[PDB]
Amino acid sequence: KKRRKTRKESYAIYVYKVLKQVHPDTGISSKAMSIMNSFVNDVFERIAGEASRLAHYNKRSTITSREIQTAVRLLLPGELAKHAVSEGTKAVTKYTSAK
Amino acid sequence: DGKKRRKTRKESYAIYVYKVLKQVHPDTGISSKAMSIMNSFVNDVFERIAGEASRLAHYNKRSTITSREIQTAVRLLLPGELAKHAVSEGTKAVTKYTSAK
Amino acid sequence: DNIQGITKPAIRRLARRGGVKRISGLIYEETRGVLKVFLENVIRDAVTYTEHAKRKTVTAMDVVYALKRQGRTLYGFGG
Amino acid sequence: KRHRKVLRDNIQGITKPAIRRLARRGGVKRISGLIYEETRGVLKVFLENVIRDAVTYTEHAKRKTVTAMDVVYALKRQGRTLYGFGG
Amino acid sequence: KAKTRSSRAGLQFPVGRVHRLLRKGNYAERVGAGAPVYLAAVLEYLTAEILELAGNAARDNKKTRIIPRHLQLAVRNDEELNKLLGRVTIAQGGVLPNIQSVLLPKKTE
Amino acid sequence: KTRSSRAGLQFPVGRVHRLLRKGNYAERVGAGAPVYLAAVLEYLTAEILELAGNAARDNKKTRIIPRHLQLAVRNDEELNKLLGRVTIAQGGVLPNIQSVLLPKKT
Amino acid sequence: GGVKKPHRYRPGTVALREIRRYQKSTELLIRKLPFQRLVREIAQDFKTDLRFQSSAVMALQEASEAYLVALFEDTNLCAIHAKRVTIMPKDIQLARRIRGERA
Amino acid sequence: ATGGVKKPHRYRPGTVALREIRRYQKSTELLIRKLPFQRLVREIAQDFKTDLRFQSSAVMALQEASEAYLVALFEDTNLCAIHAKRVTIMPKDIQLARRIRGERA
DNA sequence: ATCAATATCCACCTGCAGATACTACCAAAAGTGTATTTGGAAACTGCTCCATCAAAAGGCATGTTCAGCTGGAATCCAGCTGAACATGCCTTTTGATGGAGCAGTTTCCAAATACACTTTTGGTAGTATCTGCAGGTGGATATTGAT
DNA sequence: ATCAATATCCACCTGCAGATACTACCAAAAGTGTATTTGGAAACTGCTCCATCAAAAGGCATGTTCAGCTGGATTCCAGCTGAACATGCCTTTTGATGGAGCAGTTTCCAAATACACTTTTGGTAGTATCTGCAGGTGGATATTGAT
Ligand SMILES: [Mn+2]
């Protein structure tokens, strides 16, 4: 049964987890979910690749968190960035404090 | 009196270009300005190719870029007749490499 | 009929979604003759991936990348 | 010994002829009256746009100057890759 | 295992998967352990941010389950997102109610 | 002996090789690829050079500059498409005027 | 011979009404076969006798149409810009040029 | 006797326009004036972020790239009046050109 | 067709910065040789899934008829947008000197790679009810378009 | 203002294409100390370049006047197009299999690759002579426009 078991690992579950922390009583069609996986996926590369670009310009090799900030700064439009730029500078200092 | 702290070597193809220039037009010159477009010609295209290739790897979960990917890369990127020639031109020198030593 | 097998009312149907009130007679061909380029260009890019992975079937992944690199990126098929 | 005087409303430092000139180069014969102003703002939007970027480069490299490369990085990344100035 | 890195940040986004995901594409040689979080966080929020306005779009047309149309309406009716996906098509999304000005009956008023 | 002459080229299969490892597009770099690459780049350079050359001549000049280059590039179908979102310093445009903009009937 | 004054929704109305009808609908607006016929007629010219995955053709029927749908909004504008309401194919041609299509 | 308008030589409205299109198309030098454009690159940065420096070069692109822009947008616009059946470019034309390009909404 | 009045071809020359042209050093890069280490051709076959056929139905299409009026086409007419004319200012040009703040050499450490061994859970693969909806039923009356 | 003639939009009705939640399951995705690897910031610190005033000067922007002609609103008007409305061909479908062929597998040598020598070279400084083209003056033919 482990034969055709080549996994198609997706964010879908994590997305439903999140689907609840603001709208805890909501359904979402598996086709409307298929979109949300194409979302974060898109958002992943976009930012990553930019932070990947942001290396060599500076003759860099280690992607530090910084170039992610910048990536997103460069990436995300107006007000909508501010929050994100914040949201992530948050969690970083939490895990700094954490184990 | 020169050489005052060794400046990180800025390296272009201004030679490789001009080499291949003289081949096309023996008496026909070239600005810095005129060249300094040409270097970006390379610059631009390389990365466009290395890029599209790198993409193909992870589309087939491959860890290496073969000259087969480059072809596909070129085959996708470079349009029309510009692709054909290139494809062959690529191979031509590839073959001169594969059948040496 | 293939390309002519694309219906004048279907042409109208899609146009209406764009908010087209009035459709001139010529449009019907032009629409087809603008839909063609789209496809040629799209599929060209698509199959080129097929022909790389060594496949006789145009996968879904074959397309996403076509439309992505085309610039007309699509959502909800990459699974 | 420094300078840095007040810096405001330079957009009109983009002057009718010079605007109008691009209108020639464009292959344009008869120019409306609202154009020149409308035009001045699009340039800003533009500028406005590319410079957020080229600075967010300078800004980032922990630089205090807008090196040629930045601007180009910022131009390409927007859709307008430019050959000539570097990289 | 004791507890998660994603919990050490309080999310629903796998700070684990990120750190490996950011290797497979070969985005660099070395990775600062700050980044895989910084990313997840942003991506997380972002995903939510839509879901919000999508879930907000649910009640309006008396339906409970989110369909693409609600995700499309979520996206396009916003400014800052419309732009972020000004070059993207959501499958089956359809188009926002928009009729041009001159088109209405009895000339143009 | 060098790998260029070895593949019969003018471009550096050495130097493009470096810029494939240091570049990071994958970990493992092929052996035909960097060749194929140099070759690839070399064709293009050449293609366009043999273009802005005649250009350079058209206006009776012998030192190819950007203008001729952008004349080459633009005046040609396949290249244009390769550089549809590209830009060329002191580019110049391709001389051209729309028709209804020309005067007739006295 | 007649009917004594019939109901005829004076022309243009059914159009505006269908706009109202079609704009809020999300499902595609071309028969799948003719499309899949055309999706297979052209594709051959790149590699011969192939197969199309279940989803693959539709991903196109999404995009293909999605492209067109918008491509029309743009056309209308031009027509409207020329103080018109009927989309003459000249509009399309103009609206192609601009995106970076015929230029 | 009193019949022959005036004497000074004047060219018809638009025949210098043609004369010029022909010209600023033939060549290539940047079309707004250096130092005036300059400040507009200085001042828009200083507004994003102060205590900053532009490389001798780096303003240049911002200019080169910036003309380019319009001249090419202008072309799109020139086309738009012609399409509306005209010889004159009124904002809308641009706004329309910006529109389709996908520049605004 | 000829006269007149500006802008321009067309070759002519200076003159200098912009290319191209040596030495000379010289640091990295490129190449040779083997050693290690491995990602992927190369056939074999499973099984989810892709290709027409089957077989009634009619939904969606086309060829159809009539007007309802929008494109384009002139007609005029107020006035903007171009050509020109007279000024002058601020752009442009060329060095000149502090002095920033960038770049490269030299150091030593926080953080990360590369192993190695056990731990948790996300995709897979079913069996079964769960469940909001996605398309008929009355019934109502606004949105349409005759009077 | 009158009110036939449709299309539309509300709760209320039920069945199935579709989401919800549990049990079984096992290679892999993930986390954890460890022992060792090096990027990268951090300071001294050369050296290049940009910010800056200088003064000359001069080309190019300003603004104003005067008209020639292109836009705008004018009514128009003939045939192009939506509507209806008749069929009726031609998608839709599900129903359920022939059968690829993509997926999956375990191999196994060519291919990649990291390690230590080796040898050229291409790039910068610096040094010093040529040489293409902008650019000014000047002498025939071009185009435009008032005749
Ligand atoms: Mn300011």
Automatic annotation (TrEMBL), chain E:
It is found in: Chromosome; Nucleus. This is Histone H2A. Core component of nucleosome. Nucleosomes wrap and compact DNA into chromatin, limiting DNA accessibility to the cellular machineries which require DNA as a template. Histones thereby play a central role in transcription regulation, DNA repair, DNA replication and chromosomal stability. DNA accessibility is regulated via a complex set of post-translational modifications of histones, also called histone code, and nucleosome remodeling. The chain holds residues 14 to 122 of 130 of the full protein. Residues 1-76 form the Core Histone H2A/H2B/H3 domain. Belongs to the histone H2A family. Keywords: Acetylation, Chromosome, DNA-binding, Isopeptide bond, Nucleosome core, Nucleus, Phosphoprotein, Ubl conjugation. The nucleosome is a histone octamer containing two molecules each of H2A, H2B, H3 and H4 assembled in one H3-H4 heterotetramer and two H2A-H2B heterodimers. The octamer wraps approximately 147 bp of DNA. One of its GO terms (cellular component) is nucleus. Residues 79-109 form the Histone H2A C-terminal domain. GO terms for molecular function: DNA binding; protein heterodimerization activity; structural constituent of chromatin. It comes from Xenopus laevis. GO terms for biological process: heterochromatin formation. Its main location: nucleus.
